[PDB]
Each structure stands twice: as structure tokens, then as C-alpha cells.
Design an enzyme around this catalytic site. Structure first.
Site, PDB file in Angstrom:
ATOM      1  N   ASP A  25       0.851  -1.189   0.000  1.00 16.92           N
ATOM      2  CA  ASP A  25       0.000   0.000   0.000  1.00 16.92           C
ATOM      3  C   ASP A  25       0.889   1.242   0.000  1.00 16.92           C
ATOM      4  O   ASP A  25       1.261   1.750   1.061  1.00 16.92           O
ATOM      5  CB  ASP A  25      -0.933  -0.038   1.211  1.00 16.92           C
ATOM      6  CG  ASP A  25      -2.006   1.028   1.161  1.00 16.92           C
ATOM      7  OD1 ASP A  25      -1.919   1.936   0.309  1.00 16.92           O
ATOM      8  OD2 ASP A  25      -2.941   0.946   1.982  1.00 16.92           O
ATOM      9  N   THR A  26       1.222   1.739  -1.196  1.00 21.24           N
ATOM     10  CA  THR A  26       2.073   2.920  -1.290  1.00 21.24           C
ATOM     11  C   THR A  26       1.391   4.166  -0.744  1.00 21.24           C
ATOM     12  O   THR A  26       2.072   5.153  -0.446  1.00 21.24           O
ATOM     13  CB  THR A  26       2.501   3.161  -2.741  1.00 21.24           C
ATOM     14  OG1 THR A  26       1.345   3.255  -3.582  1.00 21.24           O
ATOM     15  CG2 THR A  26       3.401   2.035  -3.229  1.00 21.24           C
ATOM     16  N   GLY A  27       0.069   4.146  -0.603  1.00 20.64           N
ATOM     17  CA  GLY A  27      -0.652   5.264  -0.040  1.00 20.64           C
ATOM     18  C   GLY A  27      -0.727   5.276   1.467  1.00 20.64           C
ATOM     19  O   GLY A  27      -1.343   6.179   2.042  1.00 20.64           O
TER      20      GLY A  27
HETATM   21  C1  LIG Z   1      -8.269  -1.204   2.205  1.00 14.37           C
HETATM   22  C2  LIG Z   1      -6.858  -0.838   1.741  1.00 14.37           C
HETATM   23  C3  LIG Z   1      -6.545   0.643   1.968  1.00 14.37           C
HETATM   24  C4  LIG Z   1      -6.666   0.985   3.453  1.00 14.37           C
HETATM   25  C5  LIG Z   1      -7.517   1.501   1.161  1.00 14.37           C
HETATM   26  N1  LIG Z   1      -7.125   2.905   1.156  1.00 14.37           N
HETATM   27  C6  LIG Z   1      -5.937   3.278   0.408  1.00 14.37           C
HETATM   28  C7  LIG Z   1      -4.775   3.560   1.362  1.00 14.37           C
HETATM   29  O1  LIG Z   1      -3.607   3.782   0.625  1.00 14.37           O
HETATM   30  C8  LIG Z   1      -5.044   4.790   2.220  1.00 14.37           C
HETATM   31  C9  LIG Z   1      -5.010   6.069   1.386  1.00 14.37           C
HETATM   32  C10 LIG Z   1      -5.149   7.270   2.317  1.00 14.37           C
HETATM   33  C11 LIG Z   1      -3.936   8.142   2.633  1.00 14.37           C
HETATM   34  C12 LIG Z   1      -4.081   9.341   3.571  1.00 14.37           C
HETATM   35  C13 LIG Z   1      -5.438   9.666   4.191  1.00 14.37           C
HETATM   36  C14 LIG Z   1      -6.651   8.793   3.878  1.00 14.37           C
HETATM   37  C15 LIG Z   1      -6.506   7.595   2.938  1.00 14.37           C
HETATM   38  N2  LIG Z   1      -3.963   4.878   3.179  1.00 14.37           N
HETATM   39  C16 LIG Z   1      -4.152   4.632   4.589  1.00 14.37           C
HETATM   40  O2  LIG Z   1      -5.227   4.419   5.045  1.00 14.37           O
HETATM   41  O3  LIG Z   1      -2.991   4.654   5.368  1.00 14.37           O
HETATM   42  C17 LIG Z   1      -3.125   4.788   6.857  1.00 14.37           C
HETATM   43  C18 LIG Z   1      -2.222   4.075   7.391  1.00 14.37           C
HETATM   44  O4  LIG Z   1      -0.858   4.976   7.244  1.00 14.37           O
HETATM   45  C19 LIG Z   1      -1.217   6.210   7.359  1.00 14.37           C
HETATM   46  O5  LIG Z   1      -0.753   7.068   6.120  1.00 14.37           O
HETATM   47  C20 LIG Z   1      -1.838   7.324   5.419  1.00 14.37           C
HETATM   48  C21 LIG Z   1      -3.094   7.174   6.439  1.00 14.37           C
HETATM   49  C22 LIG Z   1      -2.754   6.224   7.326  1.00 14.37           C
HETATM   50  S1  LIG Z   1      -8.428   4.011   1.107  1.00 14.37           S
HETATM   51  O6  LIG Z   1      -7.983   5.402   1.221  1.00 14.37           O
HETATM   52  O7  LIG Z   1      -9.308   3.850   2.262  1.00 14.37           O
HETATM   53  C23 LIG Z   1      -9.299   3.731  -0.452  1.00 14.37           C
HETATM   54  C24 LIG Z   1     -10.336   2.624  -0.554  1.00 14.37           C
HETATM   55  C25 LIG Z   1     -11.057   2.385  -1.873  1.00 14.37           C
HETATM   56  C26 LIG Z   1     -10.730   3.255  -3.082  1.00 14.37           C
HETATM   57  N3  LIG Z   1     -11.409   3.035  -4.335  1.00 14.37           N
HETATM   58  C27 LIG Z   1      -9.688   4.359  -2.977  1.00 14.37           C
HETATM   59  C28 LIG Z   1      -8.965   4.597  -1.662  1.00 14.37           C
END
Ligand SMILES: CC[C@H](C)CN(C[C@@H](O)[C@H](Cc1ccccc1)NC(=O)O[C@H]1CO[C@H]2OCC[C@H]21)S(=O)(=O)c1ccc(N)cc1
Lengths: 99, 99
Positions: A25-27
Site C-alpha cells: 500500500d504505497t498510499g
Molecule cells: C483497504 C486498503 C486501503 C486501506 C484503502 N485505502 C488506500 C490507502 O492507501 C489509504 C489512502 C489514504 C492516505 C491518507 C489519508 C486517507 C486515505 N492509506 C491509509 O489508510 O494509510 C493509513 C495508514 O498509514 C497512514 O498514512 C496514510 C493514512 C494512514 S483508502 O484510502 O481507504 C481507499 C479505498 C477504496 C478506493 N477506491 C480508494 C482509496
């Protein structure tokens, strides 16, 4: 290896002597794993995703092997929808995005 | 190009005649962008992550340019805290994970 994104980049991880499937999960800044038992001390923390904030247990300096690559870093444990490997560990295994 | 993960993989995108910063997110199934007034029809949807679900508007066959790489596909719009480029468009620009 080179991983395309037509399907979810799911890989097998090993943490606490246990095999699991996790999402690269690069995000995600941080690594968040579903509820599990891990040895050692932990601290309560909060993390926020797309839908709000959850309570997690923070484990520091935890050994975790991702797809045959070793890493030692912070692991958050809590009610995440799926095991996610975040950038704090992706950097350790030398993971990059390429296009 | 190659993007390391020391910091958030933010890049410039072009959608609906507007430039925005968006996250190259292998953990996101579908692209979701911060609230914006896109024309055309749409369908309601709910997407889940850490913290729970959010309600979004699903637009189909939306043109987006990511780092000069053109793409066309589904774009979700809703109260996301950050613009997210998901796998549905990362594949179209030839983006891979490598380690
Ligand atoms: C189910 C897998 C994963 C959790 C899904 N998410 C993408 C994810 O990359 C989010 C993307 C994300 C990034 C920043 C804020 C909100 C969401 N990152 C995230 O939640 O990371 C958390 C953990 O480390 C911290 O750094 C980022 C938030 C914390 S998401 O944002 O909820 C998402 C779900 C469905 C779609 N179509 C598009 C995005």
C-alpha cells in the site's frame, strides 16, 4: 520482483513466526495489521484513514519478512479492513514505483 | 521514471481542465478525488478503508493525465482527505511495484 497492478498487490508476510497475506500500500505511511497477538511492549495510538480514525496498538522494532525480504520497523495492530504494508516498511525492502 | 517511497508519492495530475496533486496509491482499488464539481451523470457508491466508509460519486470514462501519461476510466469524487490515484488508472500508465 516486478508487480503489475491489474489485481491487488497481495503478498505473503511473516510476522511473529506466523504467515499472513498483506497488501502493498504505497498510499499508507504506516503498516497496519489486523488483530493479532505480538510479544513485547506496545503503546496505544490513533491512525486516520479515508473513513476516520481507529485505535491501534503500536509495536516498535518488530521483525517482519515481506515476500522474502526482511524488515524491522513499526507495526500498528488494530481494526483495519485488511493487512496493509506501508511506506515505513516498503522503503526497507527497497520498493519503488516505476512507470 | 522511478519514485522512491521515502515520502508520499505525490504527483501532478490533470482532470477536467484542472491541475491537482494526487497520491499514487497501490492500495486503492479505484481513483478517488477530493470534492470537485464534475459535469455529467454519476452513480452513488461507498468505499471502505481505515476508519470506515465514505460516500462518493462514481464518474465513468473520465480523462486524467498523470505525469504526462494519459488515462481514462472510473473516477470517484467525495470527501476524501487527499486525492488518490488507484489501480484502475495506475495500470493504464504502466505503473509497477519493484523490489
Ligand atoms: C483497504 C486498503 C486501503 C486501506 C484503502 N485505502 C488506500 C490507502 O492507501 C489509504 C489512502 C489514504 C492516505 C491518507 C489519508 C486517507 C486515505 N492509506 C491509509 O489508510 O494509510 C493509513 C495508514 O498509514 C497512514 O498514512 C496514510 C493514512 C494512514 S483508502 O484510502 O481507504 C481507499 C479505498 C477504496 C478506493 N477506491 C480508494 C482509496
Amino acid at each position: 520482483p516486478q508487480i503489475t497492478l491489474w489485481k491487488r498487490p497481495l503478498v505473503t508476510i511473516k510476522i511473529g513466526g506466523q504467515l499472513k497475506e498483506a497488501l502493498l500500500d504505497t498510499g499508507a505511511d504506516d503498516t497496519v495489521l489486523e488483530e493479532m497477538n505480538l510479544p513485547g511492549r506496545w503503546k496505544p495510538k490513533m491512525i486516520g484513514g479515508i473513513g476516520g480514525f481507529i485505535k491501534v496498538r503500536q509495536y516498535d522494532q518488530i521483525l517482519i519478512e515481506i515476500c522474502g525480504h526482511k524488515a524491522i520497523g513499526t507495526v500498528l495492530v488494530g481494526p483495519t479492513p485488511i493487512n496493509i504494508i506501508g511506506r515505513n516498511l516498503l522503503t526497507q525492502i527497497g520498493c519503488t514505483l516505476n512507470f
